[PDB]
Scaffold this active site. Structure first.
Site, PDB file in Angstrom:
ATOM      1  N   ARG A   1      -9.582   0.458   4.568  1.00 32.08           N
ATOM      2  CA  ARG A   1      -9.376   0.642   3.134  1.00 32.08           C
ATOM      3  C   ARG A   1     -10.185  -0.322   2.280  1.00 32.08           C
ATOM      4  O   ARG A   1     -10.642   0.054   1.198  1.00 32.08           O
ATOM      5  CB  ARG A   1      -7.896   0.463   2.777  1.00 32.08           C
ATOM      6  CG  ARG A   1      -6.921   1.419   3.442  1.00 32.08           C
ATOM      7  CD  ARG A   1      -5.513   1.161   2.917  1.00 32.08           C
ATOM      8  NE  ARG A   1      -4.553   2.169   3.356  1.00 32.08           N
ATOM      9  CZ  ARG A   1      -4.218   3.240   2.645  1.00 32.08           C
ATOM     10  NH1 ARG A   1      -4.770   3.452   1.457  1.00 32.08           N
ATOM     11  NH2 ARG A   1      -3.331   4.101   3.125  1.00 32.08           N
TER      12      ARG A   1
ATOM     13  N   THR B   1       0.831  -1.200   0.000  1.00 28.55           N
ATOM     14  CA  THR B   1       0.000   0.000   0.000  1.00 28.55           C
ATOM     15  C   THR B   1       0.868   1.253   0.000  1.00 28.55           C
ATOM     16  O   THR B   1       0.604   2.202  -0.749  1.00 28.55           O
ATOM     17  CB  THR B   1      -0.953  -0.006   1.196  1.00 28.55           C
ATOM     18  OG1 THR B   1      -1.540  -1.305   1.342  1.00 28.55           O
ATOM     19  CG2 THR B   1      -2.060   1.005   0.981  1.00 28.55           C
TER      20      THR B   1
ATOM     21  N   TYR C   1      -3.117  -9.768   4.986  1.00 30.32           N
ATOM     22  CA  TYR C   1      -3.070  -8.332   5.244  1.00 30.32           C
ATOM     23  C   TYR C   1      -4.505  -7.857   5.428  1.00 30.32           C
ATOM     24  O   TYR C   1      -5.292  -7.849   4.475  1.00 30.32           O
ATOM     25  CB  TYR C   1      -2.366  -7.591   4.102  1.00 30.32           C
ATOM     26  CG  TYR C   1      -2.252  -6.081   4.248  1.00 30.32           C
ATOM     27  CD1 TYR C   1      -2.546  -5.439   5.446  1.00 30.32           C
ATOM     28  CD2 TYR C   1      -1.840  -5.298   3.175  1.00 30.32           C
ATOM     29  CE1 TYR C   1      -2.442  -4.063   5.567  1.00 30.32           C
ATOM     30  CE2 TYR C   1      -1.729  -3.922   3.291  1.00 30.32           C
ATOM     31  CZ  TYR C   1      -2.031  -3.313   4.487  1.00 30.32           C
ATOM     32  OH  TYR C   1      -1.922  -1.947   4.602  1.00 30.32           O
TER      33      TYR C   1
ATOM     34  N   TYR D   1     -13.418  -3.265  -1.930  1.00 35.58           N
ATOM     35  CA  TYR D   1     -14.539  -2.762  -2.724  1.00 35.58           C
ATOM     36  C   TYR D   1     -15.672  -3.773  -2.890  1.00 35.58           C
ATOM     37  O   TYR D   1     -16.836  -3.426  -2.672  1.00 35.58           O
ATOM     38  CB  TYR D   1     -14.059  -2.278  -4.099  1.00 35.58           C
ATOM     39  CG  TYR D   1     -15.141  -1.615  -4.914  1.00 35.58           C
ATOM     40  CD1 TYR D   1     -15.684  -0.400  -4.520  1.00 35.58           C
ATOM     41  CD2 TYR D   1     -15.623  -2.201  -6.076  1.00 35.58           C
ATOM     42  CE1 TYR D   1     -16.676   0.215  -5.260  1.00 35.58           C
ATOM     43  CE2 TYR D   1     -16.617  -1.594  -6.823  1.00 35.58           C
ATOM     44  CZ  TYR D   1     -17.139  -0.387  -6.409  1.00 35.58           C
ATOM     45  OH  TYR D   1     -18.128   0.224  -7.145  1.00 35.58           O
TER      46      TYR D   1
ATOM     47  N   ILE E   1       5.588  -4.218   9.552  1.00 31.90           N
ATOM     48  CA  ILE E   1       5.707  -3.760   8.175  1.00 31.90           C
ATOM     49  C   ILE E   1       5.431  -2.266   8.236  1.00 31.90           C
ATOM     50  O   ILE E   1       4.274  -1.836   8.316  1.00 31.90           O
ATOM     51  CB  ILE E   1       4.750  -4.483   7.225  1.00 31.90           C
ATOM     52  CG1 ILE E   1       5.124  -5.967   7.147  1.00 31.90           C
ATOM     53  CG2 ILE E   1       4.794  -3.849   5.847  1.00 31.90           C
ATOM     54  CD1 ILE E   1       4.301  -6.763   6.162  1.00 31.90           C
TER      55      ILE E   1
ATOM     56  N   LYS F   1      -0.808  -9.465   8.688  1.00 27.73           N
ATOM     57  CA  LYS F   1      -0.423  -8.101   8.947  1.00 27.73           C
ATOM     58  C   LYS F   1      -1.703  -7.355   9.296  1.00 27.73           C
ATOM     59  O   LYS F   1      -2.652  -7.223   8.520  1.00 27.73           O
ATOM     60  CB  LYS F   1       0.286  -7.406   7.772  1.00 27.73           C
ATOM     61  CG  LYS F   1       0.357  -5.898   7.897  1.00 27.73           C
ATOM     62  CD  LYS F   1       0.767  -5.317   6.559  1.00 27.73           C
ATOM     63  CE  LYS F   1       0.871  -3.791   6.595  1.00 27.73           C
ATOM     64  NZ  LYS F   1       1.193  -3.192   5.326  1.00 27.73           N
TER      65      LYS F   1
END
Ligand SMILES: N[C@@H](CCCC[NH3+])C(=O)O
Ligand SMILES: N[C@@H](CCCC[NH3+])C(=O)O
Ligand SMILES: [Mg+2]
Lengths: 296, 295
Positions: free
Chosen positions: B139, B44, B134, B108, B204, B163
């Site tokens: 998001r 990202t 992740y 989405y 990360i 993550k």
């Protein structure tokens, strides 16, 4: 401005053995046309735009443009992306392949600022000569197109003529039409179609219309004729199916409804989308029986 | 088989709209030389969404060859909200020398838990390098539930952890208390130490782009169970950790790197843009309290 308004359908994309059933897609579009629909939205969210190849997206836009030739129905092609160079390219293709306009969802995942959203849509608007409808759905994107950003875009770019709102925020739709009464506010949430229409909205982009195109088509035209009592009545009767069609994420329930209605063969999704739960499967079937679904 | 420790989500520098490949390699060598244990290309923070599949490949290759001959591993970003796209990205990564893949939850389209399970099984059963989940619901629009993560850990040998970028320390207790064998990785720089102090095994980091030595020391102190020195660094980093999200990552970090002279131009790919003037000055303020290593 040049506009695309009225009752519109976010078309599902039927699959047969993992491929786009082209004859089914074309067959479903004609069923929409014949039930009073004013526009069709190919390869939107309901059409699983995210998991279609760029080559399949162009096939489904061409099927839509080719099925609406000779009719009053327009094609508002889905051409959004969270990458601006990607969204410009999709808008360019859709224009060059006969679409009457583009629906362009706000960038998802990367959460641009209001300034970034402005430059993103300005670039898209500067990319074609057909009308451009913004699409705001923060529950999926992670971002909101503010009222100011929409109005600035409306006044600075000739193609941007309104917004498809799927934010469950009637306050924002008052905000929009009170400061810019010229824009075309489109409902993106079937359950509040009439309340959005009753405040000056000029159309809907519906999920339910996949199954009951005539009822959504009737709701919109009553409202646009200022027959608000007839519009609200249809809105009220459709509330149950409108909510149940989101028992799981759209388009899992609506495709399930189409399959149960015998309007598509096979309940096929593309991963990570999958068939609903048993519970949701049975609940959908229950709500469906209270409604009359038109055939082909 | 895992990839843990202090890792950097590399920013992706652009020069005239193109990926500055020599600046990209020079930023990776600076991370290596400052004690970082792994690099995360095209995550990202690397603007993965706006890079082409051809550029994505380029930065994964630059990472593998810049870390060839070192103990530093490459955890390549290879997620997608379309499973066939995610499978393909994972395969390349493997084919291209990456030590593992970071696979963001589909964004989405909001898949169900069953859809997320099959999404990751498809990826895991298709390649043989380690796979780190992740989860960043702010998001994507979806959460990988604790049950789903644990099921993936237990049903696929390649899936070794997650993550977490959800600001939900409760969930991080939930995970490591029911499946203490997984590798929980922090994706939120401000709470690196609390996640490590509950059994997390690495970070990360966004902050490590600018202060790699400080993030590296924090993680290794913690993994050495020197929690007092780890927390001390985490507390000192709070201001820069927070200001680095005054606008959405990586808008602030690229501004910081540019202000510090670590990249030569403040270039983003749209819809990303330079920050407001106000946030530009605030980032400039907070940086002054930290010692920034050069090349
Ligand atoms: N899955 C990616 C690429 C879509 C390509 C066109 N269907 C996205 O949603 O942005
Ligand atoms: N920007 C699109 C295209 C994929 C390229 C990077 N993952 C997406 O995020 O899905
Ligand atoms: Mg639990």
């Amino acid at each position: 401005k040049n506009i695309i308004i009225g009752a519109m359908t976010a078309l599902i994309t039927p699959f047969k053995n993992g491929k786009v059933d082209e004859q089914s897609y074309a067959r479903l579009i004609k069923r929409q046309i014949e039930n009073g629909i004013d526009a069709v939205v190919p390869v939107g969210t309901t059409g699983e735009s995210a998991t279609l190849t760029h080559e399949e997206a162009r096939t489904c836009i061409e099927i839509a443009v080719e099925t609406c030739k000779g009719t009053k129905v327009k094609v508002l092609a889905g051409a959004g992306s969270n990458a601006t160079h990607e969204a410009v390219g999709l808008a360019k293709f859709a224009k060059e392949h006969g679409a009457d306009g583009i629906l362009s969802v706000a960038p998802y995942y990367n959460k641009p600022t209001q300034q970034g959203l402005y430059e993103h849509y300005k670039a898209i608007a500067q990319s074609v000569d057909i009308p451009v409808l913004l699409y705001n759905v923060p529950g999926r994107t992670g971002c909101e197109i503010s009222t100011d950003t929409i109005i600035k875009l409306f006044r600075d770019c000739e193609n941007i003529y309104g917004v498809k709102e799927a934010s469950g925020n009637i306050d924002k739709c008052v905000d929009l039409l009170a400061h810019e009464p010229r824009m075309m506010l489109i409902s993106g949430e079937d359950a509040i179609n009439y309340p959005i229409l009753s405040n000056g909205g000029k159309g809907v982009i519906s999920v339910t219309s996949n199954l009951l195109p005539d009822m959504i088509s009737a709701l919109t035209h009553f409202a646009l004729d200022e027959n608000y009592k007839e519009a609200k009545k249809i809105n009220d009767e459709l509330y149950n199916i409108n909510k149940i069609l989101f028992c799981e994420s759209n388009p899992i329930p609506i495709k399930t409804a189409m399959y149960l209605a015998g309007l598509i063969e096979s309940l096929e999704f593309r991963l990570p989308l999958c068939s609903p739960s048993k519970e949701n499967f049975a609940k959908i079937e229950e709500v469906m029986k209270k409604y009359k679904i038109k055939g082909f």
